[PDB]
Nucleic acid binder design. Structure first.
Ligand SMILES: [Zn+2]
Lengths: 125, 130, 56, 102, 108, 207, 119, 71
RNA sequence: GUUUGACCUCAAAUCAGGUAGGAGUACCCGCUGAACUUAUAUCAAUAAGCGGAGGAAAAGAAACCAACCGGGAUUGCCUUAGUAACGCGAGUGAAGCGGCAAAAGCUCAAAUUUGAAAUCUGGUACCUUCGGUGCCCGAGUUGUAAUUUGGAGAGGGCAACUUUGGGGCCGUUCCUUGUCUAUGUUCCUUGGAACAGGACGUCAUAGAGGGUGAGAAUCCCGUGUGGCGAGGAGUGCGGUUCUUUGUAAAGUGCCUUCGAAGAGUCGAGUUGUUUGGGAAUGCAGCUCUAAGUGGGUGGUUCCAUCUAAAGCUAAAUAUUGGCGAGAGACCGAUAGCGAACAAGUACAGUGAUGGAAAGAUGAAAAGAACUUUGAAAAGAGAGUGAAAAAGUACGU
RNA sequence: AUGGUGAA
RNA sequence: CGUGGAGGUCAGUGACGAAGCCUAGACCGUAAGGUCGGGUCGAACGGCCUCUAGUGCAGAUCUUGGUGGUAGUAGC
């Protein structure tokens, strides 16, 4: 149960905020958990997902499929993973949208900012 | 409200503020001893009763020395100008201690001060000198 | 807007169908002039029936 | 006071007094203070007039003559008009109701 | 028609204001010291109620001056007169008790 | 809204036009012209007897009657059969009324509190909650009333030392003081015999 | 790519003017060739570069104006603050806090005291 | 009969009277009446652009701060 | 001196430093103001119109209320009370006392600084710039500097009287703002998709809430408690301090000498307005117009209270407008603001103005590849999708 | 009734 | 008897199908109505004690919306 008076437990307000959230906030929204093998290494459960990261699908019809993220579709609240595509009847290949919460990160693309965030979040490297 | 609808539709962004929590949360900032002993969980009247300080001198409306010694502990815890000192020196080594004569000293007593004021100033000067 | 979406796509469908009809008529005329083009197109285009797309 | 204030918008009306009269006209002398002047602004005894609440005092009848014309005084002589002739209508025409009816 | 839907809200606001005043005014008891006054109008001539402030004579008898008394949170009334020598005695005793029960911090 | 309905501008055509005398909107070209208004029978018109804010919401209740109701509700908690008829799973409680040692009020962690409650035969009552959780039925799903659940055991304490915060999160379980003893909590839905887990200090202070 | 503001911050007025002229000439040439190609994204880049150069030049001019107006009061209104019309007037802090001699003497003689009422 | 009004361009400028029947041009005070609630709403602040009034609330929240960040 | 300069007045400057217009308008402060509606009374000191500011506005510390053992700024609630009072019908309709919320009192005029216009606006050079100093000029003596408002107050003498200001730094308070802070996605069944049922684990000062292919505590975002920062407001206060300044200032008791209070103003007269107000009090035009042991307000042949004709003040008070937040036993696309969507938009009016209809595919367009009949529109095969008995004329 | 619009 | 919502209650029902709709289906009650059989449908709703009302339509030359006879007629 909430205790702060500055937070509203209103379904309408939450729905309005989620759909109208900006890209910067959507980056925090589009967070995915880390594989337990990586959790023991970096000591962190979830991190923001970016294009260079490699993720594994654990839910949906494409369970057991892993690949690199081709792009992060923040507008549609979904991400695209390499080798996960829907073959159209015309022979064209279209990536299948996937929510980050349904994907498990197998590898992380290291950077100065990523390392700083990991250190800030209590992780180790 | 036309303005409210335009602001919501506009992409400028509402100047969001959040201060409801701070309305209930009040920090005591008028005494160091009380601040270290004040309990925000208890009410103002409850805190005053706990510390022993009276909250309302009059009878409160409706129904209803642990730390006071600290205040008592802390409870128990001029000069003359150079020109004034020089003038008093002239009064001294012109008349000495005869304030009655000094009262009529036109040259030295430029201001016709009373005998009492002159004697008080002389005593103050002496207390800081020989 | 529902009205905008309905109106915009209604015109698009008409134009697309008209263009397809004109292209098909021109292609039929050219095939009548040059029947070989029909064979060339058929050699590369398949109806992709469910039976033809068996997954072994 | 209103006439002098309207022309001298930048000035603030403080008070007024009678000086002369005529069969066809009556003359009054009005005193005004310029809040913009730094002397008044830095004068504690008179810097209060610079407050925006005191803008166009004569228009709202906050002057000595305006207050007198409003019948604002202490005594039974002004009980029915102690606090204006308009707020009384709202006071008497408003039905006060509480959460728990009395 | 006016309905007081903010009775609880008004009470909460008043309580918060009192708490804020106490936080700003930690040592003093959120108010001054008031005298004991007998109500008029016969029907209430036998009722004693708190007054506005002590008279100048009462403050002088208490052993302190009005100017200094006001700084110690003592209400002083310059228009109230003393005519019965029992409320005056009660007020003097109350002022003496207040003086005995007050602890004053130094300027520095 | 008071302005509802009256915003539209309309007038009554009257007799001689062979049409209903309901006021109709003026103008033309917009389609709204000639449409009836100013009536509860008209689309978009003022509703008959519009609801007003000054409707009697709160109800005054005699203090003695409130005290009597609270006393009756408290007394109903000491009857196992009555409490069972209330729907609480008190079939395996060591005794009724249930009194626990004063050390219960000093529990801080929720795990310890729930373990203690389970150890005293309240496990069935706790399990009753979190299993009946069902979505709100009707239009209340989208009015901050989505979820409803059965009431859990009530814990009464003489003084608070962390039990109120410890048991706040566990669903169904509610905490109250002996001084208040809210009637609504004691007898939810005007029903007697709620399962109450008392404490030695609370039991002594009830006298 | 495009120019950067910090790079231009280290260039003199004449160099900035020459760069602005060159960028304007390039923009004009691109516009003359706009119909030559279906779409040239470099037009937006050169426009942004021109805007940045103009902003840098304006900032330099404003800083020079401020420097030449240093010290003296009643500076040009443009260089002044833009809080709002109401706050500009109405008894700035020094005027508001002014206290007459009598009030100051009374406050010094009888300042508010801190006290507690238990003993 | 009527011409575009410079102040509002409502096409309510009376040529004969050389005045606008909507905004009252060239009257100093914009025409508006309490009984015309719909008319007031049609011209209430916010219907236009509010070039400067929009950011007043945002600026106030910052205390009308002047200067630049410190990085 | 047939002449010069001052005082006073009147004008010009695209001179320097300043301000008012308007918009908005729920609340406030003044002017003005009708009819429907009901038997001068009453709608009604209302609607509309006009002028003026704010976050509140007005009022505010008695020429008060009272006849009591007297109370002691204004303000709002209950009560007084549907009483007094008016109209004596219809009806209108208050206030003292009492309880509650909050309480802060002050600023001028009036008596000589005259052993020193000691005051202040403006320009200039600097500095530690919401300002300070030096110089210059001007305003002022037809009064700017000290003190005082009867609660008095002032000039002197005596206490073996008592007391004392200014500016930075860090902390502390507040505003803005970034960030950290727990636990399964284990097994079986079904389902397009598990967020569905059963079994087995874990956190809970964290089971408010939202998203993820259908009801998710343990997938994520989030919530509970605490931690780490950065930029601003401020003297509310604890240290650190640099300065103090000078026969300088203030407070108490005693002794002596003085000791000043608002005029075309009250009031009477007369003509209009206001109230349900019987002593039209109150407000509005005008003939007239006073005293200082005085005058006003009252009850009894005397007594009770105050000191009007000057002004300031935060608090409790109102709020259908604005900014920003927390909620509903409220409505749910013929409902709810006229407007859930290109809504004050289309549209109509020479114009003041009036003013609607319109929500939902599918999880993902994967929006029907390709063949073919077809002036153009639609079909027949074929195909994706759980569903085309979901075809962008799409939730049923 | 109030506030405005037009006009052989 | 029936409906909008609320407190309680069935550790209720439900993607192995909740609501609604259709039904030349049956059952129960004198009736208001309730239950079940079969088809479409897809994600909420119900058994019972109370509270609550913007709570029940055959008309008001009723309002909003949709569709017919006149009629493929007068007419262009
Ligand atoms: Zn115009």
């Amino acid at each position: 149960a909430k205790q702060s008076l500055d937070v509203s437990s209103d379904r309408r307000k939450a729905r309005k905020a989620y759909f109208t959230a900006p890209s910067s906030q959507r980056r925090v929204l589009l967070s995915a958990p880390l594989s337990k093998e990586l959790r023991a290494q970096y000591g962190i459960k979830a991190l923001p997902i970016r294009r260079d990261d490699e993720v594994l699908v654990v839910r949906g019809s494409k369970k057991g499929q892993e690949g690199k993220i081709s792009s992060v579709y923040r507008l549609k609240f979904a991400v695209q993973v390499d080798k996960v595509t829907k073959e159209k009847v015309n022979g064209a290949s279209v990536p299948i949208n996937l929510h980050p919460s349904k994907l498990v990160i197998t590898k992380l693309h290291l950077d100065k900012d990523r390392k700083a965030l990991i250190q800030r979040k209590g992780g180790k490297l | 409200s036309v303005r409210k609808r335009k602001m919501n539709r506009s992409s400028v962004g509402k100047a969001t503020r959040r201060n409801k929590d701070k309305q209930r949360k009040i920090n005591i900032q008028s005494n160091p001893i009380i601040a270290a002993n004040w309990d925000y969980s208890l009410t103002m009247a409850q805190n005053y009763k706990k510390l022993g300080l009276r909250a309302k001198l009059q009878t409160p409306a409706g129904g209803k020395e642990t730390e006071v010694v600290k205040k008592l502990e802390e409870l128990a815890s001029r000069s003359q100008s150079e020109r004034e000192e020089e003038w008093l020196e002239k009064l001294y080594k012109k008349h000495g201690d005869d304030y009655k004569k000094m009262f009529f000293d036109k040259k030295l007593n430029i201001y016709q001060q009373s005998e009492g004021d002159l004697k008080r100033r002389l005593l103050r000067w002496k207390k800081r000198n020989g | 807007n529902k009205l905008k979406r309905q109106e915009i796509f209604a015109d698009i469908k008409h134009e697309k169908n008209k263009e397809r009809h004109t292209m098909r008529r021109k292609r039929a005329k050219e095939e009548r002039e040059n029947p070989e083009l029909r064979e060339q197109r058929l050699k590369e285009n398949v109806t992709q029936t469910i039976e033809n797309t068996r997954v072994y | 006071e209103e006439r002098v204030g309207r022309r001298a918008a930048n000035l603030r009306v403080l008070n007024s007094y009678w000086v002369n009269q005529d069969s066809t006209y009556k003359y009054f002398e009005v005193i005004l203070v310029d809040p913009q002047h730094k002397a008044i602004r830095r004068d504690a005894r008179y810097n209060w007039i610079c407050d925006p609440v005191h803008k166009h005092r004569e228009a709202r009848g906050l002057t000595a003559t305006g207050k007198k014309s409003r019948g604002i005084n202490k005594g039974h002589k002004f009980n029915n008009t102690k606090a204006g002739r308009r707020k009384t209508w709202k006071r008497q025409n408003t039905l006060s109701l509480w959460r728990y009816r009395k | 028609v006016k309905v007081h839907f903010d009775q609880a809200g008004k009470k909460v606001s008043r309580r918060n204001a009192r708490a804020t005043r106490a936080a700003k005014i930690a040592p003093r008891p959120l108010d001054l010291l008031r005298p004991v006054v007998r109500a008029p109008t016969v029907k209430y001539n036998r009722k004693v109620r708190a007054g506005r402030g002590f008279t100048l004579a009462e403050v002088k008898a208490a052993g302190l001056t009005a100017a200094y008394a006001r700084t110690i949170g003592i209400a002083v009334d310059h228009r109230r007169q003393n005519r019965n020598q029992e409320i005056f005695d009660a007020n003097v005793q109350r002022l003496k008790e207040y003086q005995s029960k007050i602890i004053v911090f130094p300027r520095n | 809204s008071e302005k509802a309905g009256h915003q539209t501008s309309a007038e009554s055509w009257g007799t001689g036009r062979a049409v209903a005398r309901i006021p109709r909107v003026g103008g033309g070209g917009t389609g709204r012209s000639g449409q009836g208004a100013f009536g509860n029978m008209c689309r978009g018109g003022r509703m008959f007897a519009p609801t007003k804010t000054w409707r009697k919401w709160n109800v005054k209740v005699n203090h003695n009657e409130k005290r009597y109701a609270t006393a009756s509700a408290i007394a109903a908690t000491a009857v196992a059969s009555l409490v069972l008829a209330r729907g609480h799973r008190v079939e395996k409680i060591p005794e009724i009324p249930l009194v626990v040692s004063t050390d219960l009020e000093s529990i801080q962690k929720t795990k310890e509190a729930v373990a203690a409650l389970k150890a005293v035969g309240a496990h069935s009552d706790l399990l009753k909650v979190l299993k009946s959780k069902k979505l709100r039925a009707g239009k209340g799903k989208y009015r901050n009333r989505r979820w409803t659940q059965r009431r859990g055991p009530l814990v009464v304490y003489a003084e608070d030392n962390g039990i109120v915060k410890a048991l706040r999160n566990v669903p169904g379980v509610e905490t109250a003081n002996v001084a208040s003893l809210n009637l609504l909590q004691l007898a939810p839905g005007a029903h007697l015999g709620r399962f109450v887990i008392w404490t030695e200090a609370a039991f002594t202070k009830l006298d | 790519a495009g120019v950067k503001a910090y790079e231009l911050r280290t260039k003199s007025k004449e160099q900035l003017a020459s760069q602005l002229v060159d960028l304007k000439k390039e923009l004009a040439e691109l516009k003359v060739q706009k119909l030559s190609r279906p779409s040239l994204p470099k037009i937006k880049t050169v426009r942004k570069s021109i805007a940045c150069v103009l902003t840098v030049i304006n900032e330099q001019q404003r800083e020079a104006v401020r420097q030449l107006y240093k010290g003296k009061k009643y500076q040009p209104k443009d260089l002044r603050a833009k809080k709002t019309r109401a706050l500009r007037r109405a008894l700035t802090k020094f005027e508001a806090s002014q206290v007459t001699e009598k009030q100051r003497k009374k406050q010094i003689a009888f300042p508010q005291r801190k006290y507690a009422i238990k003993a | 009969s009527h011409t575009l009004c410079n102040r509002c361009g409502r096409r309510s400028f009376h040529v004969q009277k050389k005045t606008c029947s909507s905004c009252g041009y060239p009257a100093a005070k914009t025409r508006s009446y309490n009984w015309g609630a719909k008319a007031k709403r049609r011209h209430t602040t916010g219907t236009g652009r509010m070039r400067y009034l929009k950011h007043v609330s945002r600026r106030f929240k910052n205390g009308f701060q002047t200067g630049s960040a410190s990085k």
